[PDB]
Amino acid sequence: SLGPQVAEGENVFGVCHIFASFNDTFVHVTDLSGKETICRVTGGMKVKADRDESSPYAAMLAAQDVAQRCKELGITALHIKLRATGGNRTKTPGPGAQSALRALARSGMKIGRIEDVTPIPSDSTRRKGGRRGRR
RNA sequence: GUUCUAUUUUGUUGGUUUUCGGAACUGAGGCCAUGAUUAAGAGGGACGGCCGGGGGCAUUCGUAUUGCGCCGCUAGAGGUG
Incomplete structure (x- = not known):
């Protein structure tokens, strides 16, 4: 865990794969x-409860802890890719998406490029559920 | 022109042929003001340039889903009020 790149010259780059569903x-x-x-x-x-794994609080303290782990080994900037559930299912990022990259940016972790890599189907298979939906 | 035929007539007695009245057939005529309404804001059809997720056959592309192979790192991962 020794970065040979000089810290004062230019910035060491990395990326975190932000995947935030509605339950995790x-x-x-x-x-x-x-x-x-x-x-x-x-x-x-x-958090030791299944119902708030995707809660915006449980997301935020995960953000500095990965950043704290990513700090001694020598990375100051991260690229960000947002990921929702994708496929036939929902496409909206969960409530833990926005709190993730915000708190790490507040932790002293620089920001690279921003893009969304939701696995968007061109034309998907049958959506899970009945014809009447989740009644 | 051809065929048969009512015949009136041959003075009467007898055959015949026709003028003659009828029916039918065949050829050359003359004449028609020589005979054709319209093209439906009906229809059918032809033609010209298009037009269209119309139909059938073949071909091609695109993620995504599932499963598998390899690599990395991991204690949780799914799912729900």
Whole structure:
């Protein structure tokens, strides 16, 4: 865990894969390739209740903890990719999405580029549920 | 022109042919003001340039979903009021 890049010259870059459903929130720091990961802490592992894993509070303290983990090993800037559930299911990012990148930016972690990588189907299969929906 | 035929007539007695009245057939005529309403804000059809998620056959693309292979890191992951 020794970054040979000089801190004062230019900024070491990384990315976290922000996936935030309506029942859980995932923060997943990987490298610029994405094959190799550095840190991955979830919203559900700091709160011991199933109903508030996606809550905006359970998201926020996960944000500095990954950032604290990403600080000694030498990364100051992260790229951000938002991810919702995608597929045939809902496309809106959960309530833990916005609190994730906000608190890490407040923690002293720089921001790279912003884009959304929701797995948007061109033309999907049958949506789960009946013809009348979730009655 | 052809065929048969009512016949009036051959003075009467007898055959015949026709003028003659009828019926039918065949060829050359003359004449018609020589014979054709319209093209329906009806229809049918032809033609010209289009037009269209119309139909059938073949071909091609796009994520996403599922499953699998490999790599990385992990204690939770799904789901719900």
